């Protein structure tokens, strides 16, 4: 009865009566089985570390975990140690005796070390190769875990050439299943992970869908609104009856909107990097304690009663838009997400990204991530100019199945209304 073995370890070691979600449960059970290569794709804070930390304790041998930096490794090592777990870390920070003590333990016929954290540079080093081959030869390797697996991809936010060497390492240890985990949900990133880590097919996939049922999405065209500040004021008031957010691009527009909304009868405090750090925490504290309902911001600081998120200007990427609008309705109660779109604002953001790209190119030459940045923006322009379900467009971008939008977006609420606003936009060009 492995379910019972898992359930007892969950309580006695990790001190938990249940799994956070059933997907965390299915993922953990699939890693325990040990018959296939596993891919875990869940949001940050969804309990991905347990999906591999728990099975490692129930396996006969050692689990090797690859992670990008020592700072993040140390946090994971310090955490497991308090649970009285036999966790170790082979890195550059180790003193002469420390490394000698750890290398000796691994050379024992029955080593004490159950979980070993290493950086990719260390995994692929010729000096680590005698240790690894001995473990493979003695059938002492139970799992190979690749955390932050999106690091293999130039289509992700954190490309690391060191992660590309991990494919050849994985190929050398066939007996041991491989576990790959990330929060990045795009299909190109998933495809890069499967190919770069030389994963064995069929891969067991545990993917949290990006769909958020309680969010009402709409797109309004600033060009066709006689009183723009009046529309934002209406939207802000109607959504309440908690708190709400308004995003904009400039410090100028951030100040204009904060004063402009306070005049209409909706108390708004401007938040940007131009202000003093003393004032930053002050404005933050007041929005958190509901003294001020609206925060107009260009930058960010997690409030649970966010009833609205309004984007005064188009965001820089589809992933950025998903994350910023995603700050709404964390309590599960109904919330509203509006993106105010104009072709001039599109031309402005596009120009800004192209300069930022040329600045990186002047600094370090050409890279394949240069094209990804333009495509991440053009996917958001497509969403703004598209006629279709707002939730189905997000699902398609993140490789999810069609979501059950029960009149949960402007297009689904009334497709004719979205069509008339779009026709007026297309005609205005002539
Ligand atoms: N079954 C569980 N029940 C409750 N909390 C859990 C459970 N499993 C893990 N957690 C906790 O969830 C938090 C976030 O998990 P973590 O592994 O850091 O997530 P991720 O890698 O997805 O960002 C941690 O503080 C962890 O202890
Ligand atoms: Mg993690
Ligand atoms: Zn819809």
Author numbering: 11 to 251, 260 to 319, 324 to 452
Excerpt from the publication:
RECQL5 (also known as RECQ5) is a member of the RecQ family of helicases, which are highly conserved throughout evolution, and function in many diverse cellular processes with the role of maintaining genome integrity. Specific roles have been established for RECQL5 in almost every cellular process involving DNA, including transcription, replication, recombination, chromosomal segregation and DNA repair. The Zn2+-binding domain consists of a pair of long antiparallel α-helices (also known as the helical hairpin), followed by series of short helices and loops, from which a cluster of cysteine residues bind in a typical Cys4 tetrahedral arrangement to a single Zn2+ ion.
In an attempt to improve the diffraction properties of these crystals a new construct spanning residues 11–453 was produced and crystallization experiments were set up with and without nucleotides as above. In this case crystals were obtained in complex with the nucleotide ADP/Mg2+ in two different crystal forms, both of which diffract to significantly higher resolution (1.8 Å for the monoclinic crystals, and 2.0 Å for the triclinic). The ADP bound structures were solved by molecular replacement using the APO form as a search model, with two RECQL5 monomers in the asymmetric unit of the monoclinic crystals, and four copies in the triclinic crystals. In both cases, the electron density maps are of excellent quality throughout and the structures are very similar, although slight differences remain in the domain orientation and conformation of various loops which are discussed in more detail below. Similar but less dramatic differences can be seen when comparing the six independent chains of the two ADP crystal forms, which can be grouped into two distinct clusters of three which are separated by maximum displacements of up to 9 Å. Looking at residues at the interface between the two domains, a clear correlated difference can be seen in the conformation of residues forming the aromatic rich loop (AR loop). In the more open form H167 and D168 are pointing toward motif II, making water-mediated interactions with T194 and H160 (conserved residues from motifs III and II respectively), while in the less open form H167 is pointing away from motif II, forming a water-mediated interaction with Y419 (part of the Zn2+ binding domain). In the ADP complex, the ADP moiety is bound in the active site, making extensive interactions with residues in the D1 domain, several of which belong to the conserved helicase motifs Q, I and II. The most prominent difference is in the relative orientations of the D1 and D2 domains, with the inter-domain cleft almost completely closed in the APO form and considerably more open in the ADP bound form, with maximal displacements of equivalent residues of up to 30 Å.
